[PDB]
Every structure is written in structure tokens, then in C-alpha cells.
Paper text:
To reduce the Pi affinity of the Ser102 mutants to a measurable range, an additional mutation was introduced. The Pi binding geometry in the [name]/[name] AP double mutant, solved herein, is also indistinguishable from that in WT AP. A comparison of our newly obtained [name]/[name] AP structure to a previously obtained structure of [name] AP also reveals another active site property, an interplay between Ser102 and Arg166 in positioning bound Pi that underscores the role of Arg166 in specifically stabilizing the transition state. Comparisons of X-ray crystal structures of AP with and without Ser102 reveal the same active site and Pi binding geometry upon removal of Ser102, suggesting that the destabilization does not result from a major structural rearrangement upon mutation of Ser102. The observed Pi binding affinity of [name]/[name] AP remains constant above pH 7.
[name] (AP) and other nonspecific phosphatases are some of Nature's most impressive catalysts, achieving preferential transition state over ground state stabilization of more than 1022-fold while utilizing interactions with only the five atoms attached to the transferred phosphorus. The AP active site contains three divalent metal ions and additional positively charged side chains in position to interact with the negatively charged phosphate monoester substrate. We tested a model that AP achieves a portion of this preference by destabilizing ground state binding via charge repulsion between the anionic active site nucleophile, Ser102, and the negatively charged phosphate monoester substrate.
Residue numbers in the entry:
A (entry chain A), B (entry chain B): 4 to 448
Write the structure that this text describes.
Amino acid sequence: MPVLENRAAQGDITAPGGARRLTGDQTAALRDSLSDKPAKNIILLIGDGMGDSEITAARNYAEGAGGFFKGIDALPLTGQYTHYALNKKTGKPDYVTDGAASATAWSTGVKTYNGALGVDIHEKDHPTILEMAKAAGLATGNVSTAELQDATPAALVAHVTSSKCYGPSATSEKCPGNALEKGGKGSITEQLLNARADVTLGGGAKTFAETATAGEWQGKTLREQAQARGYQLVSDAASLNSVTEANQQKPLLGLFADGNMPVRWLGPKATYHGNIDKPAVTCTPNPQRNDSVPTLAQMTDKAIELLSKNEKGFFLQVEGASIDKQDHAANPCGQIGETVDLDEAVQRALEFAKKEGNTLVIVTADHAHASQIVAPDTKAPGLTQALNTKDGAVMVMSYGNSEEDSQEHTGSQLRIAAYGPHAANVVGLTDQTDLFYTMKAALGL
Amino acid sequence: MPVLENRAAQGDITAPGGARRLTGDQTAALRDSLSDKPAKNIILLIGDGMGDSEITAARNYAEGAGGFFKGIDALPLTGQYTHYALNKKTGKPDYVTDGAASATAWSTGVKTYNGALGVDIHEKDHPTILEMAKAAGLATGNVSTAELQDATPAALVAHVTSSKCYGPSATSEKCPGNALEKGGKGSITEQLLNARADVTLGGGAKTFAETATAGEWQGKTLREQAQARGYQLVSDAASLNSVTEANQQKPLLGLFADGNMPVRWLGPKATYHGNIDKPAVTCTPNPQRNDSVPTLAQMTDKAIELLSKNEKGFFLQVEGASIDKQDHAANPCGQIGETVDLDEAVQRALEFAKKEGNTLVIVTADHAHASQIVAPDTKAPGLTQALNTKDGAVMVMSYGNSEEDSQEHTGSQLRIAAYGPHAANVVGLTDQTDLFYTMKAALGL
Ligand SMILES: [Zn+2]
Ligand SMILES: [Zn+2]
Ligand SMILES: [Zn+2]
Ligand SMILES: [Zn+2]
Ligand SMILES: [Zn+2]
Ligand SMILES: [Zn+2]
């Protein structure tokens, strides 16, 4: 069970065979990649919106066309999975999912309607993979660059009828069957605190300033409630670093931003005819992203350091969330940079799994998104931008699917990749619900 | 070695686990797909423009969201491959390839510039896989639904500086160094007639009416040259069925249309705000396609029959050409119908390979295209269309990347899948030029 140690172009891309990514026959190395033994641990990295177009754009920009991601591209067992949602009313396929339905699909193994967290079309709760791991005595972690109430982390720890039900105020008014004062389990935040994973790291500090409307902690802020229940609170990179354990007695909660955590790269918004009317853009670092905000990789390493102390095993989900968020924003530099943030975190996970030898690492996305790579001279009706790549060549990206100021998701099947025990369950055509069952079987749940 | 006999949804898509495509662990089934033994035959099926988006849109429409292509989705060993071209002047990546450069990349194993057939950026001729297979003593076939001078068939049999150089008339004017009356190898058609593949089936009849400017067949039509050299010429489905053998004495040449062969399904072109302003479309049969035109599946059937008499082995390429041609045209019914036509041919190929036991079948595209699956209510700046699927739900497709008649290719890496000996070399991230070297090492050339 190796990783792909290198799959860049092997020489001159203008000569015969110098664009090859393979040195020799792969049959031998693939046989050695196929193990059916238990997974002691699972690390699931999700790139929100990170379909094949978004993977290719970021490789082309940051590593060159012939380049190779030392995390993202290093996982040997690849396939394509479908992530279609359901219409709540009919029960038939909705071909473009949101993040709540898609994340619910892998977390719970049941399809659902757009905006649903941990509930089916019938609005009934199902147990998540995190919840099942915790019941089994495994350590758990939920890490995201987004608000911890974002669809992607919330799907592991909350069951609500709409994904907008962050805190009491919104839950009371949009998920009244889930609201705490109507006898429901609570808001996404209140449920997150009931879920009590060992490590929970991301943004979303703001909704912890809400007070509970009922229950044991009525009048307490949710920040105060977390502390009342014995959670360790950390707010920055130095405090995250200094935590020495995390468990059911001292569960860790890192709140690293008010909303979403700040993206690493800056560049202009793509504009109508923007590849024709602007100079090619080079991305810079984001000079508002303070140095004390931990990166996705730093959060991953600390999570692995704490979780790997449970001898029975652990389950860890890590989301590179603002890939999607910038793809909505039509901001190529932000998008590509957040794909780089995810590559770094994959490397940490893959490095871990090489050493430990019984960990299953899975890298995929929740759905496909808007950005396409198009020709230098393309006259498109949407938002475009020319970019200066590592190859010293112009790449143009287009966002062509909305007139309203959010570039929208797409329905294409997209890459899923895996390394370690049970990776075979990712090859060929699968559905996102199969991913729940893959993880279940590998952990012995 | 096993084929994926069924990977549809396994029950109620709304119930727990009823969207699953996997019935149990795949580790053992994937071990039994891995052989290092030599391939006696190869079938390379190319969907022109058939990216993951194109595949998903066609499955959604024709089989349903939880559906499954008995051909396209049945190949067990999957990955993603990169298909970037080069700028001719610089030798740097060009991120969106045409069909000529991409086909040249798998057919010769050297990257090239858009518009190039069988030549590098320096205009130097390189041998193709078809040419090599023949020289090694294996039978050869080249089947396409396009003109036999389209980039995809031409890159197996011609070495010209521009893909426009169809016959003498064009070659003298745009490829004056390859023109026959200047000491060149000839037009695309003239080089096809020289290459002398055992089976060649498609369209492009009209270029055979052009007459030659020099050489042995000066002053006779290219058609007459084909007759004088001992080709069996066939024009319809009845004539094709009547052929009993193909070989170097009697090579077969099927010319089934002036230009491209007619597409199977009809629909309206997508229009600005077409999902909002026009009714949901259901695809019908194409009235303009006589039953005398053989289908891609029928052409594949005959080619397999005639090539399989060579005990030493054969190489066959089959292109579903008009997936791309119609995706350019912003026509969901044309594109989807052609994707289904290709599925039928892939089925023929896998059925052959499962019984013969030493055949390597590969399905992929030359590049990705424009069509995106978007939300029912999308308000896009491009051309949209709502379609009534097999599920009984509306799917919308969007074409958002051009402002001219022709919608444009994209640069996203796309699915590549294989079955049979040496199919392991398709898994992970590969480049299009690796496909050349995979085939070459599979045949032992
Ligand atoms: Zn998402
Ligand atoms: Zn998310
Ligand atoms: Zn989104
Ligand atoms: Zn093409
Ligand atoms: Zn073609
Ligand atoms: Zn094309």
C-alpha cells in the first residue's frame, strides 16, 4: 500500500513521452494497494465544490499543467460518485444537490432534500457516522474552514429540517419542530454541543453569543454553555497548539472566526469579458488574513495528534470549505488558494496513514461547481478572468451558470480517491450514499 | 476477470441505503480485475467531448439518476486523465485542447498544438499506434460516426500540420509542405488510403470526389484510387452486412454520408432563459436519419467480426463523434442521444472482451465540453433547456461559455475507464500521452 510518490510529467512536455505521468506498469503497485483488513481510523477530507474542473484549475495554476498535488493527486484508488439530492415533495431525484443534502448522504447513508441536515424526506432523524463511531468508543473530530454551523460540519452533529437553523433564534422560526422550547433536540449549535465530538475546530463564533430559549442552560449563552459542560475553548493558533489532550472529559472546541475563516489568497472578482478587458491576474496572499488564524493543515495535525491517542481508533472529517464559497463568488484566486489549503491538509493525513498503516484516507467533494477552464480568447456571457500560471502561460476561467450574484452548483459526477484499508470501495461508479456504508464497514460498526 | 454487471441504485432511493450502487466490499473483485499478462486485442472507444458532465447528463436523462449504463459505467478500473495541449511557438501548456492535438497525444504519445495531426510542435511526423500495430502483424480498424477526416479518426492515419487539410484542394492551400505536388505525404484522405487499415468505417464521402494533383493516381478521384488499390467500398447497412473478410488484400472502407453521419435523437437548440420561458423537452427519434445508415454499435459489431480473424491480434478505435459536435451546437437531445449511441458500442466491446479473455477495452473522451447540469430554476446568462427524464423529474442543462454559434471545450480532467489486461495503468491521475504507452506496452510493440 504505497501512495503515488510522483505523478508529474516526467520530462520535456514537447518531446515523445515527456508528458507521461507513469514510469512503468501499475498492475503490481495496484495489487499491493488492495487490502481488506480493518481500518483502525478514517480521515475524510471534503473539498466543498471541488469537482474535477476545480482540481484541474488549481493544479494548472499552482503546480503547472504537468504538475502534481502531493496530497490531492497521491491517493491511488480513484472513481466517480453521484451526489444527486431528492425533491422533498415527490421523492424523485433533484439532479443538483446543496451541501446539506450531499453531506447528509455520506454522513447518514440516506438521500435527502436540499437544506436537510441528518433527516430524510420524511423529516425523521438518522444516526451519523460520527455518532456511530462515538457510540463504539472511537475518538471523533469535525474540522472545517467554514462556520461550524455550515452544512458540511453540521451534517455530522445535528438533525434539522432546514440548514439555516444555526441558533435558537433561527430554529424557533424556521425549524419549529426542532426548536428546544417546542420539545425538539435544538438548533445546529445546541445539537453540536450535545454531540460532544472530542475535537471540533472551525469558525462560527458568532452564533455562540446567542442564549438558549429553554432547557438546562436557559439564559446562558452557548459559549458559556460549552464552558459549563467542560469543553476546552481555543480561539487562535497558539492556544490550539498548547492543548495537550482532547476526550469526553475535556472535549475541544476551536472558534477561529466570527463566521467563515479567512481565505489565504486575494485576487479580483471575474467580470463580464474579463479575460479580454483586464491584464492576466497573479494571485497574492490575503493581507487581511491575520497570521494567528490556524490553517486547515495545522488544524488537521493537531486533530490527528489528539485523536490518535485512542487505541481503539478515531473518525475525523476535514472540510476545505471556501473552495465552494469562492466558486460562488466568481473569485478564481480565492477558489484556487483554498484548493491549495486542502492539498496541504491531505498531505498531513496521507503522511499519517503511511506511518500508522491501518488508516483509510478519502478525498472527494460534496458536489461539482461552476468554474470551467476555457480558451485564452473565449468571448463568454458570464464572468471570466485570465491568470498567470506556474508554466508562465495564461489560463482563462469562466463562471457561466448564473445572472444572480452567486455562481451555482452543478450536477456532474466527480472524482473520489482513497488510500488504505477498503479503498477498493471507491473505484468505479459509486453513489455518495455508498461512502457512508464504506466507512461503516471499514470501522466495523 | 469480472465486469460491473449492475451498479444502479439497489432499492428505494428515499430509504436508508436504497441509493447504494455497491452490494458488498469490492477488494476481492478488484484483485480479480488486475492482470499483467499481454493483451492480444485493444478496443479504444472515444466519446468526443464526453466529460463527466456529459456522462452524468446522459445517465440522468436515459437511465435515471440512479440508473446505470451497461457499457459506459461497467468498466471496473477508473481514473482521471489530463489532456492539455501546447502553444506551437512556446511549447508551454495550452489548457484547452482541440480534437487534433488530444487524439495526436494518445495516438503517438507526443503532445502537440491545436490543429496538428500526427506531428509535434516542430511539425515532425511521429508514428501512430494504428501504424505500429499493423507493422507488428496485427489487424487494424478505425470507426467513427464523423467524417473520416475529423480529427479523431484522422490522427491514427495522417501526419499533417493543420487538421483542415482534408483532400488535395485544402492541403495545397493550408498544408503546402504536406501537399503531394510539393513532395509531401499527401492530404488526410490520401494518407488514409496509404495507411491501409483492414477496416475503416465512418462518413466523409464527399472528399473522395476530389481528384489527385500528383503521384500514381494523378487525375483519378480518391474514390477511384481506393478501387484501383483493392478496397471494398460500402455505402449503407445492407452493403456493410454483406462483407465477409477484411485484410491487406481486401481492406474495407465504409463511407456512410457526404459529411458526418446523422445523429439519432432530435430536440430544439437550448436558448437564453429556455428552462424558464419554454416547455420541458422530451427527446424524439431524428426523422432525417434513414435506417440504411448503420449505427456505431452495428459498425463496432462488423469491425470486431472482421478483425478477430487475425490470430495475431487487432487494434480497433471507435469514436462516438457527435457528442461533442452537438455539445458545440447547444443541443441536449443530440448530445444525450449520441452518448447513448456510444454506450451501445461499448456494450458490444465489453461483450467481446469478456468472452475472448485477452482484450483491453478503454472508454474516455478527447477533452471536456460545455454542458452543465444546473438547478431547475437557474437563471443563467447562457443557453438553457429543461428536459423530462426517465425518473419523471425535470433536469436543466446550461451552455454558458460562448457568445458565438459554437459552445466551447473545457480543460477539466475527465474520467478514463478500462477492463482487461494492463487496465491498472488507467487508475489514478494519468495524462493522455500515457494512454499511448499503455496500449503500446499491452500489445508488446
Ligand atoms: Zn457544497
Ligand atoms: Zn461546506
Ligand atoms: Zn455551494
Ligand atoms: Zn473533441
Ligand atoms: Zn472527433
Ligand atoms: Zn469539439
